[PDB]
Amino acid sequence: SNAMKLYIYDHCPFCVKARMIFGLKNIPVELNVLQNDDEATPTRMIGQKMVPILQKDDSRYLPESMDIVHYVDNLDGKPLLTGKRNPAIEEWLRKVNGYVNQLLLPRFAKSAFDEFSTPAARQYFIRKKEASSGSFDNHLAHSAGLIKKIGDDLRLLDKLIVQPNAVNGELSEDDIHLFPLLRNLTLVAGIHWPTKVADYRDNMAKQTQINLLSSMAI
Numbered sequence: 001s002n003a004m005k006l007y008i009y010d011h012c013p014f015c016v017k018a019r020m021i022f023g024l025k026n027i028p029v030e031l032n033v034l035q036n037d038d039e040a041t042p043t044r045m046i047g048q049k050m051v052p053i054l055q056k057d058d059s060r061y062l063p064e065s066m067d068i069v070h071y072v073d074n075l076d077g078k079p080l081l082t083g084k085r086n087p088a089i090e091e092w093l094r095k096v097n098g099y100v101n102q103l104l105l106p107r108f109a110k111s112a113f114d115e116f117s118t119p120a121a122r123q124y125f126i127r128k129k130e131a132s133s134g135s136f137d138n139h140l141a142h143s144a145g146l147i148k149k150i151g152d153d154l155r156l157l158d159k160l161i162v163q164p165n166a167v168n169g170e171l172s173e174d175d176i177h178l179f180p181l182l183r184n185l186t187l188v189a190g191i192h193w194p195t196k197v198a199d200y201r202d203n204m205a206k207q208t209q210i211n212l213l214s215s216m217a218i
């Protein structure tokens with residue numbers, strides 16, 4: 001038995017990270033999606049508006065995706081995170097995460113994630129992102145080129161994925177960082193997915209108990 005709760009936004013890759021170990025280890029967790037404009041709830045918990053937040057069995061709260069990942073992986077004394085990391089994956093992720101939000105943010109803002117269920121929450125998101133990283137319409141109008149870019153980058157990634165259940169052969173923090181990106185990329189209609197990338201994406205979604213977004217791709 002456990003009483004763990006995880007406060008999230010469904011679109012947030014850090015929140016996906018925090019959910020992964022629960023799925024991989026079959027540890028129950030109660031997901032609670034917060035409205036994107038809700039400052040008060042997370043502030044009561046941790047003193048700031050940030051997700052993910054884990055509520056531990058003792059009722060105390062733990063923020064920071066990777067701290068949650070390691071706490072939960074370590075709680076039973078037998079971690080699954082046993083593998084080496086590949087500097088090439090860190091580099092690839094840095095490069096892709098540098099431009100990918102031009103595809104993702106405009107699509108998140110148009111999609112049925114629970115954190116955007118109210119018009120106010122959706123507007124809050126749009127306003128904040130557009131005031132920081134530019135026009136959603138401009139980015140959407142550049143989709144063809146951006147889609148070709150991610151397709152090209154995915155072809156290299158394909159050659160680096162060792163197997164569908166571990167990017168480097170044994171599960172590592174590279175899986176924790178890679179899967180959320182691939183999972184959010186399934187919201188982007190038009191991408192050419194290489195075989196090994198698709199197999200890893202599909203298997204990891206199954207093993208982590210985290211849905212892909214293909215059914216609402218746009």
Ligand SMILES: *SC[C@H](NC(=O)CC[C@H](N)C(=O)O)C(=O)NCC(=O)O
Nearest residue numbers: 012013014049050051052064065066
């Ligand atoms: S994706 C939503 C945002 N979360 C984070 O960026 C978490 C980063 C932490 N360092 C981590 O958990 O690793 C977020 O909560 N945005 C603030 C907001 O007002 O939406």
Ligand SMILES: [Cl-]
Nearest residue numbers: 013014177180
């Ligand atoms: Cl990320």
